[PDB]
């Protein structure tokens, strides 16, 4: 599954393997909700732009995609 | 043809089934554009292997029908021409190959079929076998041994090319109202009108987003005219 | 001599015209990007192997390129071109490619032209377009068609040429309302590409979308069949011929 | 060829004199394909064994072909005064060749 | 079953000589055919074979470079030439049709179906 700022907005994309672990097949992260790529994990917290799940959301911010 | 050395014929832009003096006919039909064809002389037993979904040395190493082809095959006993005294060893076929044939595959290399580890180096021996066989069909032949002549047909069912069978006709034309229509690649019924536009000419026809036909390059000029379904609606 | 690659590897094999259709298809296509052959001429310009459909462009603005010749079926056919008696023929090789000068044949009629070709499993297919400028980085509509009945290549003729090949892929078309595919998007060449091409629209809002199924392919195969191989007595079963 | 066997091996009838058509583990012991022959001189010959011991059709009467290893080892399965005659041997050989024996005169005793 | 060949194609020494053999009734092509020679009180040679259903052969390498097999299908015939011989090359020489494999039919219609008729490469006088 994949995350976008919208096609018109940008060529950046992020991707999630749906509650799937890494160590199977760049920015890479784990979440207690699967293997996440391309998005940036952020230590600051924000209102939900886009749901990820398990209390996690994503957006576009510092000028890219953030999680 | 000697079936391992089968020969194509490629034909377009002109039925003997208007008689049945010939004996044998495997078919999927009973007019259309253009065709690929092959023909052979075959002993009456081996014809078993000549169908879609078939076994044995023919399907292995001489010829292969596509299991999803479309086409038809006619055969008849050719003993009268062919099953003559002593000889007829010309009529060859392949008994072995390193691998089985794909559809319409062919091979006329004649290297000795080695078998197992044997580096047979182009010479026949035990476990070193020459690849081919031939009937040598003769007058004493029982019918399973007797030659049938056979011809094979398969259909180029793409409809922008112009071609036809021998027996076909066509009428005058009109620009309006509902009518029943035919073309060598298109037929049906419709309420024709003119067109607002013209195709890339390689396209024979325009089609709806529903994939129904919308217009066709009418051979009166390859002309382009645009058609409603004949006027219908609820009451 | 080696180069990037980009758009315009697309073509019209169908017989169905469609107005403004935005249709998508899964034929053989050019995997567009980042890999093409691009060459300076030299004293060499060698032959090379066919590879799953063949794509070309070159610039020799004098019409300096004579053209091509092909091997096939692993007699193939070669065609030679002029302002008159332009002809295609199948023959054994007897020739050389220099400028100053059998079983089937056919006959018909910054500068650069582009061509792409393939067999058609019973037919053969031909396509071309031309335009002066060096790569075709920007897209535009391409490959109006020619075709023929149904392995190798060579050519004949300070000049420039480009070489490539096709691959199985999938694409979504975009259109000019004349029913010409004015634009296209690949499914294959990015996950974002895949996303767009799967949702069947040329732009989408910010959000989350189900992208695809996946599976881990197996690493290999094992078959732990029985541990013994004692001969079944079928050479008895079929063979006590007092049956 | 140097493959060899004796001369004038002989006996009174029913005594079953035996023929060590003998060669090499590259020919006789090389191959499962060894062959044997006899005749009354001047005729076309008479084959009795084509492979080790397998007799052709019609070949049965008073024949006992065999091989072990580098010896083809045919017993004529008892003489029967059958012979103003002479006896011979052969095999298939390496590089798909073929080979022949010296052969061996026969005589018959009281 | 039929088999025939040419007889005493006599010479004076040093030279070439031709042969033909013929077999029929048997489906003549059915398997490769062998050449054989012997002389009175001498052993029997095999020198090679031809395959009717190809042009393929074997030889005994004793003989290659001066023996010359060939075969026909127009008249079910086979042939040999023995060439520029050594002085007093002289014996009787023959045709036969055995080998390794069934090739269908009579699945061991084999050698002595055709291990047959004779001819005499020779020199003589009136
Ligand atoms: C009832 O009885 C009949 C009469 O015996 C049986 O007939 C058998 O039919 C088979 C066909 O299904 C024949 O099989 C093949 O025939 C080929 C031509 O004769 C031959 O090339 C094959 O040779 C192998 O088998 C031979 C024994 O039959 C061996 O002598 C030969 O060397 C071949 O085997 C090799 O063995 C070596 C040593 O182990 C291996 O290293 C090789 O890899 C082997 N090679 C191969 C290719 O196997 C084979 O014979 C068969 O010949 C024929 N019988 C006889 C005696 O010839 C019926 O089948 C029988 N009914 C049933 C159900 O069996
Ligand atoms: C495309 O996105 C940019 C920023 O993401 C925005 O400024 C622009 O308005 C968008 N396009 C349209 C047609 O709204
Ligand atoms: C995910 O994978 C890592 C190693 O790639 C492993 O240590 C971890 O245990 C895995 N997750 C779970 C839940 O086992
Ligand atoms: C986020 O927080 C964790 C734990 O407090 C810390 O280990 C990590 O360095 C932080 N990262 C950033 C970018 O602030
Ligand atoms: C072709 O692709 C490979 C793989 O990414 C790359 O290493 C190579 O540089 C590309 N070709 C060119 C001309 O860059
Ligand atoms: C169709 O093509 C014609 C000629 O090329 C052009 O004038 C017209 O604007 C085009 N219309 C569309 C919708 O593409």
mmCIF file of N, CA, C and O in Angstrom, chain C residues 147-202:
data_model
loop_
_atom_site.group_PDB
_atom_site.id
_atom_site.type_symbol
_atom_site.label_atom_id
_atom_site.label_comp_id
_atom_site.label_asym_id
_atom_site.label_seq_id
_atom_site.Cartn_x
_atom_site.Cartn_y
_atom_site.Cartn_z
ATOM 1 N N UNK C 147 2.910 -3.279 -41.863
ATOM 2 C CA UNK C 147 2.959 -4.658 -41.423
ATOM 3 C C UNK C 147 3.187 -5.562 -42.612
ATOM 4 O O UNK C 147 2.966 -5.178 -43.762
ATOM 5 N N UNK C 148 3.622 -6.778 -42.307
ATOM 6 C CA UNK C 148 4.014 -7.763 -43.297
ATOM 7 C C UNK C 148 3.498 -9.126 -42.866
ATOM 8 O O UNK C 148 3.039 -9.278 -41.731
ATOM 9 N N UNK C 149 3.548 -10.137 -43.727
ATOM 10 C CA UNK C 149 3.471 -11.507 -43.230
ATOM 11 C C UNK C 149 4.654 -11.821 -42.342
ATOM 12 O O UNK C 149 5.698 -11.173 -42.412
ATOM 13 N N UNK C 150 4.474 -12.812 -41.482
ATOM 14 C CA UNK C 150 5.604 -13.338 -40.737
ATOM 15 C C UNK C 150 6.419 -14.121 -41.751
ATOM 16 O O UNK C 150 5.881 -14.576 -42.763
ATOM 17 N N UNK C 151 15.938 -12.234 -35.651
ATOM 18 C CA UNK C 151 17.001 -13.019 -35.040
ATOM 19 C C UNK C 151 18.332 -12.281 -35.018
ATOM 20 O O UNK C 151 19.133 -12.476 -34.111
ATOM 21 N N UNK C 152 18.562 -11.429 -36.011
ATOM 22 C CA UNK C 152 19.849 -10.771 -36.182
ATOM 23 C C UNK C 152 19.612 -9.515 -36.992
ATOM 24 O O UNK C 152 18.547 -9.356 -37.595
ATOM 25 N N UNK C 153 20.596 -8.614 -36.994
ATOM 26 C CA UNK C 153 20.470 -7.427 -37.825
ATOM 27 C C UNK C 153 21.817 -6.886 -38.273
ATOM 28 O O UNK C 153 22.852 -7.136 -37.656
ATOM 29 N N UNK C 154 21.765 -6.124 -39.368
ATOM 30 C CA UNK C 154 22.904 -5.403 -39.920
ATOM 31 C C UNK C 154 22.363 -4.157 -40.623
ATOM 32 O O UNK C 154 21.153 -3.914 -40.634
ATOM 33 N N UNK C 155 23.261 -3.369 -41.224
ATOM 34 C CA UNK C 155 22.866 -2.072 -41.768
ATOM 35 C C UNK C 155 23.839 -1.613 -42.842
ATOM 36 O O UNK C 155 24.890 -2.219 -43.058
ATOM 37 N N UNK C 156 23.451 -0.545 -43.542
ATOM 38 C CA UNK C 156 24.278 -0.006 -44.609
ATOM 39 C C UNK C 156 24.068 1.489 -44.767
ATOM 40 O O UNK C 156 23.088 2.064 -44.286
ATOM 41 N N UNK C 157 25.037 2.106 -45.438
ATOM 42 C CA UNK C 157 25.037 3.528 -45.745
ATOM 43 C C UNK C 157 26.085 3.817 -46.809
ATOM 44 O O UNK C 157 26.733 2.901 -47.316
ATOM 45 N N UNK C 158 31.103 10.995 -37.960
ATOM 46 C CA UNK C 158 30.441 12.027 -38.752
ATOM 47 C C UNK C 158 28.905 11.891 -38.797
ATOM 48 O O UNK C 158 28.247 12.678 -39.473
ATOM 49 N N UNK C 159 28.334 10.907 -38.097
ATOM 50 C CA UNK C 159 26.889 10.717 -38.055
ATOM 51 C C UNK C 159 26.527 10.019 -36.753
ATOM 52 O O UNK C 159 27.388 9.460 -36.068
ATOM 53 N N UNK C 160 25.229 10.031 -36.437
ATOM 54 C CA UNK C 160 24.718 9.631 -35.131
ATOM 55 C C UNK C 160 23.634 8.575 -35.269
ATOM 56 O O UNK C 160 22.811 8.630 -36.189
ATOM 57 N N UNK C 161 23.639 7.619 -34.335
ATOM 58 C CA UNK C 161 22.623 6.579 -34.301
ATOM 59 C C UNK C 161 22.358 6.124 -32.869
ATOM 60 O O UNK C 161 23.169 6.328 -31.961
ATOM 61 N N UNK C 162 21.186 5.502 -32.698
ATOM 62 C CA UNK C 162 20.647 5.039 -31.424
ATOM 63 C C UNK C 162 19.983 3.685 -31.599
ATOM 64 O O UNK C 162 19.362 3.441 -32.635
ATOM 65 N N UNK C 163 20.084 2.821 -30.589
ATOM 66 C CA UNK C 163 19.561 1.461 -30.678
ATOM 67 C C UNK C 163 18.883 1.081 -29.369
ATOM 68 O O UNK C 163 19.354 1.450 -28.289
ATOM 69 N N UNK C 164 17.780 0.336 -29.474
ATOM 70 C CA UNK C 164 17.119 -0.233 -28.317
ATOM 71 C C UNK C 164 16.208 -1.401 -28.661
ATOM 72 O O UNK C 164 16.103 -1.814 -29.817
ATOM 73 N N UNK C 165 15.506 -1.893 -27.629
ATOM 74 C CA UNK C 165 14.649 -3.081 -27.684
ATOM 75 C C UNK C 165 13.391 -2.847 -26.843
ATOM 76 O O UNK C 165 13.331 -1.910 -26.046
ATOM 77 N N UNK C 166 12.379 -3.698 -27.041
ATOM 78 C CA UNK C 166 11.121 -3.684 -26.290
ATOM 79 C C UNK C 166 11.098 -4.767 -25.210
ATOM 80 O O UNK C 166 11.974 -5.629 -25.146
ATOM 81 N N UNK C 167 10.075 -4.708 -24.350
ATOM 82 C CA UNK C 167 9.798 -5.746 -23.368
ATOM 83 C C UNK C 167 8.303 -5.827 -23.075
ATOM 84 O O UNK C 167 7.582 -4.849 -23.294
ATOM 85 N N UNK C 168 7.798 -6.979 -22.619
ATOM 86 C CA UNK C 168 6.415 -7.028 -22.122
ATOM 87 C C UNK C 168 6.195 -6.076 -20.958
ATOM 88 O O UNK C 168 7.013 -5.996 -20.041
ATOM 89 N N UNK C 169 5.093 -5.334 -21.012
ATOM 90 C CA UNK C 169 4.803 -4.344 -19.984
ATOM 91 C C UNK C 169 3.303 -4.066 -19.975
ATOM 92 O O UNK C 169 2.515 -4.806 -20.575
ATOM 93 N N UNK C 170 2.910 -2.981 -19.310
ATOM 94 C CA UNK C 170 1.533 -2.511 -19.324
ATOM 95 C C UNK C 170 1.520 -0.997 -19.197
ATOM 96 O O UNK C 170 2.344 -0.416 -18.484
ATOM 97 N N UNK C 171 0.568 -0.372 -19.893
ATOM 98 C CA UNK C 171 0.460 1.076 -19.984
ATOM 99 C C UNK C 171 -0.992 1.511 -19.993
ATOM 100 O O UNK C 171 -1.880 0.771 -20.420
ATOM 101 N N UNK C 172 -1.209 2.727 -19.506
ATOM 102 C CA UNK C 172 -2.453 3.458 -19.680
ATOM 103 C C UNK C 172 -2.231 4.565 -20.694
ATOM 104 O O UNK C 172 -1.262 5.317 -20.586
ATOM 105 N N UNK C 173 -3.126 4.654 -21.673
ATOM 106 C CA UNK C 173 -3.105 5.721 -22.659
ATOM 107 C C UNK C 173 -3.810 6.977 -22.161
ATOM 108 O O UNK C 173 -4.681 6.938 -21.289
ATOM 109 N N UNK C 174 -3.435 8.099 -22.771
ATOM 110 C CA UNK C 174 -4.127 9.376 -22.670
ATOM 111 C C UNK C 174 -4.171 9.969 -24.065
ATOM 112 O O UNK C 174 -3.362 9.614 -24.925
ATOM 113 N N UNK C 175 -5.080 10.917 -24.271
ATOM 114 C CA UNK C 175 -5.643 11.114 -25.594
ATOM 115 C C UNK C 175 -5.729 12.573 -25.985
ATOM 116 O O UNK C 175 -5.758 13.478 -25.150
ATOM 117 N N UNK C 176 -5.765 12.765 -27.297
ATOM 118 C CA UNK C 176 -6.414 13.892 -27.941
ATOM 119 C C UNK C 176 -7.744 13.393 -28.476
ATOM 120 O O UNK C 176 -7.827 12.294 -29.033
ATOM 121 N N UNK C 177 -8.790 14.212 -28.320
ATOM 122 C CA UNK C 177 -10.164 13.786 -28.583
ATOM 123 C C UNK C 177 -10.449 13.417 -30.038
ATOM 124 O O UNK C 177 -11.544 12.922 -30.320
ATOM 125 N N UNK C 178 -9.500 13.598 -30.962
ATOM 126 C CA UNK C 178 -9.467 12.877 -32.234
ATOM 127 C C UNK C 178 -9.374 11.351 -32.142
ATOM 128 O O UNK C 178 -9.453 10.677 -33.172
ATOM 129 N N UNK C 179 -9.236 10.780 -30.948
ATOM 130 C CA UNK C 179 -8.981 9.373 -30.803
ATOM 131 C C UNK C 179 -7.552 8.994 -31.078
ATOM 132 O O UNK C 179 -7.288 7.847 -31.448
ATOM 133 N N UNK C 180 -6.622 9.925 -30.873
ATOM 134 C CA UNK C 180 -5.189 9.687 -30.965
ATOM 135 C C UNK C 180 -4.648 9.620 -29.549
ATOM 136 O O UNK C 180 -4.989 10.455 -28.711
ATOM 137 N N UNK C 181 -3.782 8.646 -29.295
ATOM 138 C CA UNK C 181 -3.194 8.497 -27.971
ATOM 139 C C UNK C 181 -2.132 9.575 -27.814
ATOM 140 O O UNK C 181 -0.944 9.336 -28.046
ATOM 141 N N UNK C 182 -2.563 10.777 -27.441
ATOM 142 C CA UNK C 182 -1.650 11.890 -27.242
ATOM 143 C C UNK C 182 -0.715 11.713 -26.048
ATOM 144 O O UNK C 182 0.294 12.419 -25.977
ATOM 145 N N UNK C 183 -1.008 10.798 -25.122
ATOM 146 C CA UNK C 183 -0.195 10.636 -23.921
ATOM 147 C C UNK C 183 -0.298 9.195 -23.448
ATOM 148 O O UNK C 183 -1.173 8.447 -23.878
ATOM 149 N N UNK C 184 0.640 8.796 -22.589
ATOM 150 C CA UNK C 184 0.595 7.469 -21.991
ATOM 151 C C UNK C 184 1.288 7.467 -20.634
ATOM 152 O O UNK C 184 2.144 8.310 -20.359
ATOM 153 N N UNK C 185 0.891 6.516 -19.784
ATOM 154 C CA UNK C 185 1.512 6.264 -18.485
ATOM 155 C C UNK C 185 1.763 4.769 -18.351
ATOM 156 O O UNK C 185 0.873 3.958 -18.627
ATOM 157 N N UNK C 186 2.974 4.411 -17.926
ATOM 158 C CA UNK C 186 3.325 3.019 -17.690
ATOM 159 C C UNK C 186 2.836 2.541 -16.337
ATOM 160 O O UNK C 186 2.900 3.261 -15.338
ATOM 161 N N UNK C 187 2.366 1.298 -16.319
ATOM 162 C CA UNK C 187 2.195 0.582 -15.064
ATOM 163 C C UNK C 187 3.532 0.143 -14.485
ATOM 164 O O UNK C 187 3.763 0.258 -13.277
ATOM 165 N N UNK C 188 4.439 -0.316 -15.340
ATOM 166 C CA UNK C 188 5.578 -1.088 -14.862
ATOM 167 C C UNK C 188 6.637 -0.229 -14.182
ATOM 168 O O UNK C 188 7.184 -0.625 -13.148
ATOM 169 N N UNK C 189 6.922 0.953 -14.711
ATOM 170 C CA UNK C 189 8.209 1.577 -14.426
ATOM 171 C C UNK C 189 8.289 2.326 -13.098
ATOM 172 O O UNK C 189 9.355 2.877 -12.801
ATOM 173 N N UNK C 190 7.239 2.377 -12.286
ATOM 174 C CA UNK C 190 7.443 2.797 -10.907
ATOM 175 C C UNK C 190 6.284 2.298 -10.064
ATOM 176 O O UNK C 190 5.210 2.009 -10.599
ATOM 177 N N UNK C 191 6.470 2.183 -8.742
ATOM 178 C CA UNK C 191 5.315 1.913 -7.883
ATOM 179 C C UNK C 191 4.303 3.019 -7.956
ATOM 180 O O UNK C 191 3.101 2.771 -7.893
ATOM 181 N N UNK C 192 4.775 4.254 -8.057
ATOM 182 C CA UNK C 192 3.867 5.364 -8.286
ATOM 183 C C UNK C 192 3.183 5.222 -9.630
ATOM 184 O O UNK C 192 1.968 5.435 -9.746
ATOM 185 N N UNK C 193 3.962 4.869 -10.650
ATOM 186 C CA UNK C 193 3.429 4.515 -11.958
ATOM 187 C C UNK C 193 2.375 3.429 -11.844
ATOM 188 O O UNK C 193 1.286 3.539 -12.415
ATOM 189 N N UNK C 194 2.712 2.363 -11.121
ATOM 190 C CA UNK C 194 1.770 1.289 -10.840
ATOM 191 C C UNK C 194 0.505 1.794 -10.168
ATOM 192 O O UNK C 194 -0.596 1.367 -10.519
ATOM 193 N N UNK C 195 0.651 2.672 -9.182
ATOM 194 C CA UNK C 195 -0.492 3.239 -8.483
ATOM 195 C C UNK C 195 -1.421 3.958 -9.441
ATOM 196 O O UNK C 195 -2.616 3.646 -9.517
ATOM 197 N N UNK C 196 -0.866 4.899 -10.198
ATOM 198 C CA UNK C 196 -1.637 5.673 -11.163
ATOM 199 C C UNK C 196 -2.306 4.768 -12.181
ATOM 200 O O UNK C 196 -3.517 4.845 -12.413
ATOM 201 N N UNK C 197 -1.526 3.872 -12.760
ATOM 202 C CA UNK C 197 -2.002 2.994 -13.811
ATOM 203 C C UNK C 197 -3.045 2.008 -13.299
ATOM 204 O O UNK C 197 -3.961 1.641 -14.041
ATOM 205 N N UNK C 198 -2.950 1.596 -12.034
ATOM 206 C CA UNK C 198 -3.978 0.745 -11.451
ATOM 207 C C UNK C 198 -5.266 1.504 -11.187
ATOM 208 O O UNK C 198 -6.355 1.009 -11.498
ATOM 209 N N UNK C 199 -5.174 2.718 -10.647
ATOM 210 C CA UNK C 199 -6.389 3.487 -10.409
ATOM 211 C C UNK C 199 -7.023 4.038 -11.676
ATOM 212 O O UNK C 199 -8.147 4.542 -11.599
ATOM 213 N N UNK C 200 -6.361 3.929 -12.828
ATOM 214 C CA UNK C 200 -6.959 4.283 -14.112
ATOM 215 C C UNK C 200 -7.378 5.750 -14.187
ATOM 216 O O UNK C 200 -8.436 6.082 -14.721
ATOM 217 N N UNK C 201 -6.560 6.635 -13.624
ATOM 218 C CA UNK C 201 -6.732 8.061 -13.853
ATOM 219 C C UNK C 201 -5.365 8.719 -13.800
ATOM 220 O O UNK C 201 -4.463 8.256 -13.098
ATOM 221 N N UNK C 202 -5.224 9.804 -14.551
ATOM 222 C CA UNK C 202 -3.930 10.454 -14.699
ATOM 223 C C UNK C 202 -3.550 11.358 -13.539
ATOM 224 O O UNK C 202 -2.405 11.816 -13.504
#
